């Protein structure tokens, strides 16, 4: 019954407002979600008229946006690394909106080698010399239009070095963008341009 009415709150001059209409249904504030990092548990609730809301708690995985080309891949959220609001939202591994998350860098690698025939990041040679089966799916040249179009493509393989390191280490920093307590998903965007320059102050330089 956690009411969100302003019939508390001593008014803007400081004086108290007195009684006001014992409580009302339309002001209920249901408790929090605190979506931790587990096995996809979702409880659904019933709201103002009719409609339902799917609360995440112990959420597993999300489909993130590669920002600069708009590609969405369902991927494994590893863990959280930052939160602007509260540091117990880091340590207790609560996913909320825009809290910075390490995820995978693998399902963006495999789903780009069509467009990104030079594959990112550079996978290691001393133990992965076997081929299951990349060069056949890099180009194969087809004697036909689309692998010829991959030379009309691959003029966009100019991705930043900062993502080139994380794509080699296979742990890409992505920032969540949905409200997981209110939609039951965590579908973030990969921070690339303006924030990957930023937020590594807020992780690396604060050691």
């Amino acid at each position: 019954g956690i009411s969100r009415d302003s019939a508390h709150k001593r008014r803007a001059t400081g004086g108290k407002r007195k009684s006001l209409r014992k409580k009302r249904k339309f002001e209920l504030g249901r408790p929090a979600a605190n979506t931790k990092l587990g096995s996809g548990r979702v409880h659904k609730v019933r709201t103002r008229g009719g409609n339902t809301k799917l609360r995440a708690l112990r959420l597993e995985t999300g489909n993130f946006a590669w920002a600069s080309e708009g590609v969405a891949r369902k991927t494994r959220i590893a863990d959280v690394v930052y939160n602007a609001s509260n540091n117990e939202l880091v340590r207790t591994k609560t996913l909320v909106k825009n809290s910075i998350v390490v995820i995978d860098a693998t399902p963006f690698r495999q789903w780009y080698e069509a467009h990104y025939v030079l594959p990112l990041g550079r996978k290691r040679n001393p133990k992965h010399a076997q081929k299951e089966d990349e060069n056949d799916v890099l180009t194969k040249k087809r004697s036909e239009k689309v692998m010829k179009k991959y030379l009309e493509r691959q003029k966009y393989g100019k991705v930043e070095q900062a993502l080139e390191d994380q794509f080699t280490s296979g742990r890409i920093l992505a920032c969540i963008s949905s409200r997981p307590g209110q939609c039951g998903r965590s579908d973030g965007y990969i921070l690339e341009g303006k924030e990957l320059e930023f937020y590594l102050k807020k992780i690396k330089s604060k050691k």
Partner: protein, 261 residues
């Protein structure tokens, strides 16, 4: 929606445009939430009982519409307190009556008879030319008709002629300063033609300067003005004498020169 939704209507809360008795009964019809507004709608219970006088009480009327005798715009409308708003064509086919809701000279409702071919169509203002409903373009009229696929030239605040046997539009008129009009709901409600000017106040309520047939002028807002044709050229047969808004002396001579005397 709390403590709602207020399903009664006393007397002295209903609009006085219904010209209701004040005593006799202590409630009003409560027009049941149809395609027109609450105060903008003369409910079928008032039209039959009070000013057609065909059914004398609230029980004799529900034996009529449930006999499926009256119908508005081809739909049977057997809700006994259906809203049945303005410019509608109340077609009582037995015994061949063809009624319409048109406001008075004095702005209240009247009784109006028309022809059968006049019962084929009606005029409706448009409010919103939204885009996205069926299929891409879209148009919602004043009375709650969603005429899909209109003409593209028809922007907002025009009126179209919808032949109500179909849902097609066939005669649209542009809101411009050479046009007959009619006012629905102010001080000047029930005054006809022939607008000269809209004073475009950005944000909002650009009030519209109108000049009547007899040369007098008035003014209302844009939501009140309902265009009904070009200069001195309607598309509907106007009521008793034509919304000219007589003086307060002109009641007196007419009450004696046009009386049994």
């Amino acid at each position: 929606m709390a403590r709602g939704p207020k399903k009664h209507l006393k007397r002295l809360a209903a609009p006085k445009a219904w010209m209701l008795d004040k005593l006799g009964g202590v409630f009003a019809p409560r027009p049941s939430t149809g395609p027109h507004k609450l105060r903008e709608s003369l409910p079928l219970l008032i039209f039959l009982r009070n000013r057609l006088k065909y059914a004398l009480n609230g029980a004799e009327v529900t034996k009529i519409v449930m006999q499926r005798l009256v119908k508005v715009d081809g739909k049977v409308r057997t809700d006994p307190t259906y809203p049945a708003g303005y410019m509608d064509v109340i077609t009582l086919e037995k015994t061949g009556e063809f009624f319409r809701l048109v406001y008075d000279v004095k702005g209240r409702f009247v009784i109006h008879r028309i022809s059968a071919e006049e019962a084929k169509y009606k005029l409706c203002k448009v409010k919103k030319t939204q885009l996205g409903a069926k299929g891409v373009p879209f148009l919602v009229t004043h009375d709650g008709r969603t005429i899909r696929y209109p003409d593209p030239l028809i922007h907002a605040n025009d009126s179209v002629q919808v032949d109500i046997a179909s849902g097609k539009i066939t005669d649209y008129i542009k809101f411009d300063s050479g046009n007959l009009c009619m006012i629905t709901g102010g001080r000047n409600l029930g005054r006809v033609g022939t607008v000269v000017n809209r004073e475009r106040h950005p944000g909002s309520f650009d009030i519209v300067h109108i000049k009547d047939s007899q040369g007098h002028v008035f003014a209302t807002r844009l939501t009140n003005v309902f265009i009904i044709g070009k200069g001195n050229k309607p598309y509907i047969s106007l009521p008793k004498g034509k919304g000219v808004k007589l003086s307060i002396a002109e009641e007196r001579d007419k009450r004696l020169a046009a009386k049994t005397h």
